[PDB]
Curated annotation (Swiss-Prot), chains A, B:
It comes from Streptomyces globisporus. Contains an active site 4-methylidene-imidazol-5-one (MIO), which is formed autocatalytically by cyclization and dehydration of residues Ala-Ser-Gly. It comes from the Bacteria. Changing residue 83 to F: Complete loss of activity. Changing residue 290 to A: Despite a decrease in activity, it shows lyase activity over time and still produced some amount of beta-tyrosine. Catalyzes the MIO-dependent deamination of L-tyrosine generating the corresponding alpha,beta-unsaturated acid, (S)-beta-tyrosine. Substrate binds at residues 83, 192, 298. Keywords: Antibiotic biosynthesis, Isomerase, Lyase. The keyword Metal-binding does not apply. Signal peptide: none annotated. This is MIO-dependent tyrosine 2,3-aminomutase. Belongs to the TAL/TAM family. The active site is at residue 53. Pfam families: Lyase_aromatic.
Length: 526, 526
């Protein structure tokens, strides 16, 4: 029942459990062995005063400075402190945990030549609930953020408790723990990695996929509410015509979500109803029936499908990175110490940047879907703005759309950060990834999307009441509707909406709608 | 040697060699008979005069309008004409050909229900040097762009002639061909797809892969000419510590490039040299030896690899799109007319936007490399800006580095377009992909990168004969160095640089350096 951080199997979903659910983390005895053993071979090497970066030489540009092994502890200590210069807000408990969890798993791969105590210590914090106070800003892609974490391993820096930072020492005494003392290369192996962006990015992509599911969930409800066609979700057009993985998944998810609905119609019905409306004598015939529907309710598989692909690619990279020795230098039995740049988070930087873009478009789609039901000219017969009473006198959902519309614009002002490298440290770092910035951007767009989806969920439910097509809703649709109605009542007369939207946005955040679907239906969502 | 457009096996490279090398295109009778199978049943359905988007109805928001069969011809004609609102510059011959192919390969799938003569007419044009005049702007992701290619088939619009356009009516009769007639679904099937972004992206991604190869090529020459370390490219540092596909591919390419070099140095020896330079004691010493070279010379596998992974994914989505039925509606046997949205180039929109970002970081790395070699402090001994004679009097490459630095900034000004959807057509197209814009974006950064590498190649060659390290160069470096001089002589004294730069860039775009290796060397670069 405990998460296994062996540095080879760790998954994104598992990182969330540890970060969010608090799942316990255990370092297999086999890993500790590879560590303890490797810690002995490496120690013997450094014990000869041999040139080894971050162990017997300066840091970064100062690699030209040779340090005698006599200052083994000071070298690693001065590093953690001098580099503990993070600024800005502190990371959320869950975020901070994902970060540490990613680092623990990094050194656990048995290539950082660290003592087991370090692995045990990190694990202790994750289990005993000792969350380090990690400043969001500082890493160039993740020295600063990781330096603040490492600081807590020696009884320094700050620990996060109730959103506020508290001296690590005072907290250790309260827990009875005795601060550790960094050893040969111990301080460098703790901060030198992509754990910051990998842990944060892990949570995002994980939740991103949940957001994708919840997007399809509400989209299905809306489709049934407006009585759209199902043809656009037939397997033939995807599994065959367009074999895009993500596209096929979305289409399949929609097909199941709308299973058993008396609202949705099939092409064979639209053409049947159309060929009958043309009852007119001949020629150019103007009909009130639409053989199809706007892209917002037709190209769902393609758009959300492309979003899924990006997410898959991200999870893949995130998976590989999680189980990789992002560190330097690296030790390898019967080999010279590896001196490269595995701390560089370009792969994750590019990934998160892509999630930001992908997520932005997911929000674009939802926003336009909201605009659809609110537009009397595009609502397919629904009252303008879903007003149940007297229009004009009541605005209905008119004011509820702006926050969603305003969000699409905001999300569009977030540009990729993985290409914004700036040379620092005597040019020694002439090319960086800025991965942590990319991960945070993705998190913002993700967060914003919840608020947009909140307006879409409320609108849908409202649409259901207005049209009075609840008894026509499918099994999954009914669950979605009720899941929303349980949080927010139908909009009869105009009223304060701010709280209503924040309420559903929170629910969507906790994957509350994806839940109601699993426990209320036999539906299995991809 | 001909390439077959069957709609299932067509590859990116095939598209390149077809649009570039003027390769011949073959449509296996299998696909022909499939289009027949389709073209046979469908036409029958249209005979029943039953509703069918584009075939017996309006387009977009005009879907409510129903067109009686008696106008099968006109309808398909008005659409192609009125939608021929392409503006901006005209695509190049290869670009266009690359698009016309993508459209043929799509119709070859056999779900577009178009007459086989359509695939025969398209497959011909490509084989008979008849390229249409495609305006670059107008597609929302690609009616307009494809509306022009469809115009030439009906003997209308303009065809590409020596850079300029010319009435298709003149060229046709000037070849022995007579305009065609568009039957039901013929005009909509020709313009209702993502051939623009897919065809354009294909070339870009294909050329991008070579850039990565050529980026690695010169990078190796520089590392050698600067006497860098090999540790960074060791196999263990990747296949074991960080098994990122691209990262592994890059780390393997660098080893084969600097394979057997006299200028390169092994860590063991670096470690042994430094050690000897250290005086006994328990203090800190200052050395001139660098155990580790700067990021621009040690983080290639990570950065360039991240790019590779992005190009890999992009090539993947393209290969799927290339062989997908990106049309609408779709015709299958035993099934109803699938009315979906596979014309939505979202899958490629994201793909290309991702390429733009990746290739941008690639330029950042290359540029910082040019800076690393031109800065006497980061040159590692090389003279100021590689000045052959007396400095101050001669600037050397000082003025050359400016265009490269400037290009890095210009590239950063290109933002993602796949998220810039703008509603139109009575809200019928509430969500688009702007995929064609995304593809151009990558095409620009790709072209810009050629100039960046051009300055890097020249600078690198200069560094070589500036320190007299040619004899130390390895088999591959020599080949690379040789390729440079064959076009541009070594810089003896200040002189016009524009030509030399544009010359090396024009060569890079052709892949002169990538080939020089496969031949003069035998190296099979990934």
């Amino acid at each position: 029942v405990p998460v296994s951080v062996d540095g080879e199997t760790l998954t994104v979903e598992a990182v969330r459990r540890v970060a969010e659910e608090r799942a316990t983390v255990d370092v297999p005895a086999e890993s500790i062995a590879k560590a303890q053993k490797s810690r002995e071979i490496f120690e013997g090497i450094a014990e000869q005063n041999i040139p080894i970066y971050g162990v017997t030489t300066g840091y970064g540009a100062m690699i030209y400075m040779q340090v005698d092994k006599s200052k083994e502890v000071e070298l690693q200590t001065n590093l953690v402190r001098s580099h503990s210069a993070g600024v800005g807000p502190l990371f959320a408990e869950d975020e901070a945990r994902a970060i540490v969890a990613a680092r623990l798993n990094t050194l656990a791969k048995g290539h950082s030549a660290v003592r087991p105590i370090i692995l045990e210590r990190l694990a202790q914090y994750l289990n005993e609930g000792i969350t380090p106070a990690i400043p969001e800003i500082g890493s160039l892609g993740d020295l600063a953020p990781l330096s603040h974490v490492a600081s807590t391993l020696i009884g320094e820096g700050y620990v996060l408790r109730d959103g506020r930072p508290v001296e690590t020492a005072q907290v250790l005494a309260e827990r009875g723990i005795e601060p550790l003392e960094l050893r040969f290369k111990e301080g460098l192996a703790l901060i030198n990695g992509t754990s910051g962006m990998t842990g944060l990015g892990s949570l995002v992509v994980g939740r991103a996929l949940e957001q994708a599911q919840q997007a399809e969930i509400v989209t299905a409800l809306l489709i049934e509410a407006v009585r759209g066609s199902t043809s656009p979700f037939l397997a033939e057009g995807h599994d065959i015509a367009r074999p895009h993985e993500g596209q096929i998944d979305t289409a399949a998810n929609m097909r199941a979500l709308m299973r058993g609905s008396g609202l949705t119609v099939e092409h064979a019905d639209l053409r049947r109803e159309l060929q009958k409306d043309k009852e007119a004598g001949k020629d150019v015939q103007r009909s009130e029936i639409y053989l199809q529907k706007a892209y917002s309710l037709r190209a769902i598989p393609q758009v959300v499908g492309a979003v899924r692909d990006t997410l898959y690619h991200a999870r893949h990279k995130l998976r590989i990175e999680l189980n990789s020795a992002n560190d330097n230098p690296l030790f390898f039995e019967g080999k010279e110490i590896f001196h490269g740049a595995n701390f560089h988070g370009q792969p994750i930087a590019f990934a998160m940047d892509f999630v930001t873009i992908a997520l932005t478009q997911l929000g674009v789609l939802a926003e336009r879907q909201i605009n659809r039901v609110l537009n009397r000219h595009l609502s397919y017969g629904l009252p303008e703005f879903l007003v149940s009473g007297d229009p004009g006198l009541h605005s209905g959902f008119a004011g509820a759309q702006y926050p969603a519309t305003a969000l699409v614009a905001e999300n569009r002002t977030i540009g990729p950060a993985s290409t914004q490298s700036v040379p620092s440290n005597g040019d020694n770092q002439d090319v960086v990834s800025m991965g942590l910035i990319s991960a945070r951007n993705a998190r913002r767009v993700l967060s914003n999307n919840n608020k947009i989806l909140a307006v879409e969920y409320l609108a849908a439910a409202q649409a259901v009441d207005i049209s009075g097509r609840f008894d026509g809703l499918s099994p999954a649709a009914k669950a979605t509707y009720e899941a929303v109605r349980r949080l927010v009542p139908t909009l009869g007369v105009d009223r304060y909406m701010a709280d209503d939207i924040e309420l559903v946005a929170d629910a969507l955040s906790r994957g509350e709608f994806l839940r109601a679907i699993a426990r209320e239906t036999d539906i299995q969502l991809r």
